[PDB]
Design an enzyme around this catalytic site. Structure first.
Site, PDB file in Angstrom:
ATOM      1  N   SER A 209       1.396 -10.664  -6.679  1.00 43.99           N
ATOM      2  CA  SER A 209       2.369  -9.724  -6.109  1.00 43.99           C
ATOM      3  C   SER A 209       3.802 -10.299  -6.182  1.00 43.99           C
ATOM      4  CB  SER A 209       1.986  -9.327  -4.675  1.00 43.99           C
ATOM      5  OG  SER A 209       2.795  -8.201  -4.216  1.00 43.99           O
ATOM      6  N   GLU A 341      -3.491  -0.722  -7.523  1.00 45.80           N
ATOM      7  CA  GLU A 341      -2.437  -1.479  -6.866  1.00 45.80           C
ATOM      8  C   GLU A 341      -1.672  -0.727  -5.779  1.00 45.80           C
ATOM      9  OE1 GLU A 341      -2.454  -4.620  -7.489  1.00 45.80           O
ATOM     10  OE2 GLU A 341      -2.191  -5.151  -9.569  1.00 45.80           O
ATOM     11  N   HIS A 449      -4.743  -3.957  -4.095  1.00 48.18           N
ATOM     12  CA  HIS A 449      -3.751  -4.990  -4.243  1.00 48.18           C
ATOM     13  C   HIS A 449      -4.112  -6.179  -3.396  1.00 48.18           C
ATOM     14  CE1 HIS A 449       0.227  -6.338  -5.431  1.00 48.18           C
ATOM     15  NE2 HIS A 449       0.460  -6.745  -4.201  1.00 48.18           N
TER      16      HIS A 449
END
Ligand SMILES: *[C@@H]1O[C@H](CO)[C@@H](O[C@@H]2O[C@H](CO)[C@@H](O)[C@H](O)[C@H]2NC(C)=O)[C@H](O)[C@H]1NC(C)=O
Ligand SMILES: CCCCCCCCCCCCCCCCS(=O)(=O)O
Ligand SMILES: *[C@@H]1O[C@H](CO)[C@@H](O)[C@H](O)[C@H]1NC(C)=O
Ligand SMILES: [Ca+2]
Ligand SMILES: [Ca+2]
EC number: 3.1.1.3
Length: 534
Positions: A209, A341, A449
């Site tokens: 991320s 995501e 995610h």
């Protein structure tokens, strides 16, 4: 018992955790406190001679993910937790937080020359710390593989403390402080890792991320010049969910708005020099003011209040253009994504239920997009619930009529299709890409995610074969295929290339596929990347 003599002669002591040896909380910079606030980190001058480093130090100040200038329950709740004495105890944070951690296999000695894996954590550029990413799983697997590696992690300033922007910040040369912190730690590794048993010439940087986008920023830093004292700071990169940051310049519209909002909140609205006023407020006041600007889970979502922005000096321009222009370090890379995501971020706008409301949310989020572009985006990502994320779930997960749609957009622009753009333009070295579908079937979120963090640091699963094994082989041989997996990982050349170009993961294991999905969204988004910058 574990010991190391640093470059300046200091000899420090670490902890022996049996399954590994660790040196935690080593300060690498002077505390960025007082007038040093928002400024570049200063290399740590001082003696560590005779000191023990057996526990992680505090993390940098954290922003409430649900923070915002509005008042609401989630904000009130997280704040209650974050300010609790039990929380303050189990997870201490401070402005004096610039420390580095070195964890190695039992028995490693100076001169061992082991490849080094440098971890950069991701927390929406607003929260995060090194202590929550246990390296033991990676270290153990590497030993078992006969490919031992040393794990290094660096704390960096997040939120207003490390990513404040605006005209004042630009004029002072203090943009992207949090990234400079990471850069200094890298230089610290170059200068000191050999004392721990690592080879400074075999450093691979990696993150997930925000940490992954950080890795991208490091490849683009100083127009691609990644050397320190004449040598490269890293020989490879692994990007887990995240490529270029789609952001305007540091002195752009939103960088200045956030700066002004924060200044009002801290009581500096009347200062002739708001920046000096901000260096003067207490940390309590600064923490308060920051929690009154949007956090990544608030309605604003991925239109982040704090994040890397081109400054024209260390990140010379729009990041998509730097990639088109060839201004990057030439290194082999692995970059991948989780199938869904955007579902976690799509939870931030569940009061958006009609198409007219979705159009307005997008308009509000992308200030540079014309109506035609907004319309094209809404054609590429239709209301049809079967088309959104969680992908391939049919009529399920219809929290609202727009949730799956908004989740598809956020995940693609912020991560998944952003990755394809990089891959289609990057010629700096061999490219390897993966796409996980390990959690297909998980309600509401899908293969969400950050689930990779679980299978890389906490639990073992089909995905660990990639998050640990393949990654260890890459850091060691610069080829993930030396891991001896049963499915060969094919080099990625282009999204239009003939044949499978993606390593894929399901609950059972690995298989290969093609990076040809949602081409209509790719073009809606990337025909003119800056129309969708924040
Ligand atoms: C969904 O919720 C958000 C969050 O409250 C609403 O946006 C805010 O609206 C208030 C009240 O008008 C404004 O003062 C805030 O500035 C807005 N916040 C942000 C972050 O923009 C939004 O209107 C709601 N959306 C729908 C479709 O009802
Ligand atoms: C619709 C609101 C959103 C619009 C903008 C979306 C694209 C801009 C993305 C900017 C970078 C975001 C990085 C998040 C890291 C999350 S981790 O988990 O660290
Ligand atoms: C930022 O850029 C300037 C201009 O090239 C350079 O002198 C400086 O050393 C860079 N900072 C970092 C951390 O690389
Ligand atoms: Ca201003
Ligand atoms: Ca070049």
């Amino acid at each position: 018992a574990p010991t190391a003599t640093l470059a300046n002669g200091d000899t420090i002591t670490g902890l022996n955790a049996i399954i590994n040896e660790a040196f935690l909380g080593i300060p690498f910079a002077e505390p960025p406190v007082g007038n040093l606030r928002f400024k570049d980190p200063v290399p740590y001058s001082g003696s560590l001679d005779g000191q023990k480093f057996t526990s992680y130090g505090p993390s940098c100040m954290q922003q409430n993910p649900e923070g915002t200038y509005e008042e609401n329950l989630p904000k009130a709740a997280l704040d209650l937790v974050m300010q609790s004495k039990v929380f303050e105890a189990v997870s201490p944070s401070s402005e004096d937080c610039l420390t580095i951690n070195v964890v190695r296999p039992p028995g490693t000695k100076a001169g061992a020359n082991l490849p080094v894996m440098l971890w950069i954590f991701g927390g929406g550029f607003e929260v995060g710390g090194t202590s929550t990413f246990p390296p033991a799983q990676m270290i153990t697997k590497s030993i078992a593989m006969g490919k031992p590696i040393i794990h290094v992690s660096v704390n960096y300033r997040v939120s207003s403390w490390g990513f404040l922007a605006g005209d004042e910040i630009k004029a002072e040369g203090s943009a992207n402080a949090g990234l400079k912190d990471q850069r200094l730690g890298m230089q610290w590794v170059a200068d000191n890792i050999a004392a721990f048993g690592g080879d400074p010439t075999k450093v691979t940087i990696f993150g997930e991320s925000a940490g992954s986008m950080s890795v991208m920023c490091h490849i683009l830093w100083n127009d691609g010049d990644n050397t320190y004292k004449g040598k490269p700071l890293f020989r490879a990169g692994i990007m887990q969910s995240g490529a270029m940051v789609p952001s305007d310049a540091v002195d752009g519209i939103y960088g200045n708005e956030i700066f002004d909002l924060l200044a009002s909140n801290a009581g500096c609205g009347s200062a002739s020099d708001k920046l000096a006023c901000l260096r003067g407020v207490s940390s309590d006041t600064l923490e308060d003011a920051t929690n009154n600007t949007p956090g990544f889970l608030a309605y604003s979502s991925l239109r982040l209040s704090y994040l890397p922005r081109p400054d024209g000096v260390n990140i010379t321009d729009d990041m998509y253009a730097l990639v088109r222009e060839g201004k990057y370090a030439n290194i082999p890379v692995i970059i991948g994504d989780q199938n869904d995501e955007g579902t976690f971020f799509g939870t931030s706008s569940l009061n958006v239920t009609t198409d007219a409301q979705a159009r307005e949310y997008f308009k509000q989020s992308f200030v540079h997009a014309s109506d035609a572009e907004i319309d094209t985006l809404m054609t590429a990502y239709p209301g049809d619930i079967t088309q959104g994320s969680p992908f391939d779930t049919g009529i399920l997960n219809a929290l609202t009529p727009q949730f799956k749609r908004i989740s598809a957009v956020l995940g693609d622009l912020g991560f998944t299709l952003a990755r394809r753009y990089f891959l289609n333009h990057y010629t700096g070295g061999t490219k390897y890409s993966f796409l996980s579908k390990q959690l297909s079937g998980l309600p509401v979120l899908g293969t969400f995610h950050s689930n990779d963090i679980v299978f890389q640091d906490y639990l073992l699963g089909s995905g660990s074969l990639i998050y640990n094994n393949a990654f260890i082989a890459f850091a060691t041989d610069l080829d993930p295929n030396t891991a001896g997996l049963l499915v060969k990982w094919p080099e990625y050349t282009s999204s239009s290339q003939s044949g499978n170009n993606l390593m894929m993961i399901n609950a059972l294991g690995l298989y290969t596929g093609k990076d040809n999905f949602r081409t209509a969204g790719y073009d809606a988004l990337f025909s003119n990347p800056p129309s969708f910058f924040v």
